[PDB]
């Protein structure tokens with residue numbers, strides 16, 4: 001009788017279909033979904049509480065790509081002994097291996113992309129922007145042409161959530177800088193990043209309360225036809241093309257714009273399945289994770305939920321690209337996407353950066369003071 005922790009955000013109703021396929025072929029085994037918070041840091045704060053207390057209730061954990069160092073060092077997961085991760089993208093083999101131990105099996109890949117209203121860019125003769133400067137010029141042109149009070153130029157995540165860590169790093173990496181064995185905090189790129197996110201609000205290109213916007217708020221608002229440009233993850237696509245959308249067939253996907261004279265870098269994301277060290281069904285949990293991390297299930301979740309695959313071959317799979325054409329071009333974006341710090345203290349890293357991003361955008365602290373505070377707090381942790 002297995003229990004799997006899955007975010008309300010990760011389309012548990014589509015995972016439920018994959019569990020039904022498992023139960024149909026595996027007699028005597030039933031799985032039940034326990035849904036968690038929409039955002040990764042909320043899920044993490046929850047799982048820390050129950051893993052700390054050695055709660056045996058949960059069997060399989062859907063964990064963020066940022067979680068293996070913590071969960072490995074805490075002893076919260078049962079390692080996949082003699083497991084070979086070489087069927088999967090090297091980036092996810094690397095994320096799920098801590099001190100030589102296979103901590104987890106990849107569930108799905110992810111990276112940030114620029115979603116855009118191809119109907120509005122096409123109306124105004126605009127190319128997908130390759131720089132943030134080009135994105136500001138396109139936004140002002142479209143907003144002034146459309147005279148739609150509800151149309152946002154750019155939605156990005158400014159809420160004090162895990163996605164705001166990603167937000168902070170996008171311009172930092174585009175400028176060619178790295179955060180880390182040791183912290184190498186570049187003040188100029190850190191301030192440039194916080195100033196850039198603030199500039200969209202100050203220019204009216206982003207709404208005044210972007211500090212309140214989480215991943216699925218960007219998703220909901222873009223889907224309701226209210227956003228020209230959206231920073232999001234692959235899952236949003238299935239929602240954009242579903243039965244409750246204002247933007248069916250009106251959505252382009254591009255790589256993120258670069259900073260003035262930078263690269264079109266992005267943030268690595270994605271999720272993996274861990275088996276709780278406290279599960280009393282280790283054997284059946286492991287067999288369930290082997291199924292859910294299999295190629296066929298990787299393919300099903302790409303087609304049915306726009307979850308980017310963990311297997312290189314699936315990005316150009318006939319049925320995958322028939323369903324989502326832009327997956328065919330997505331592999332090199334995923335394989336070159338920059339990783340957030342690997343550390344067991346990642347909760348503290350996240351808390352420092354996301355609270356600094358949110359405070360800058362809420363007008364609590366200047367971009368310069370925000371960077372100053374972040375460097376001091378990260379110094380202590382890394």
Ligand SMILES: CO[C@H]1O[C@H](CS(=O)(=O)O)[C@@H](O)[C@H](O)[C@H]1O
Nearest residue numbers: 039040110161162163215269270
């Ligand atoms: C929904 O997952 C995606 O977004 C997360 C941010 S949040 O939406 O949870 O704040 C990232 O951490 C994940 O790596 C990425 O796959």
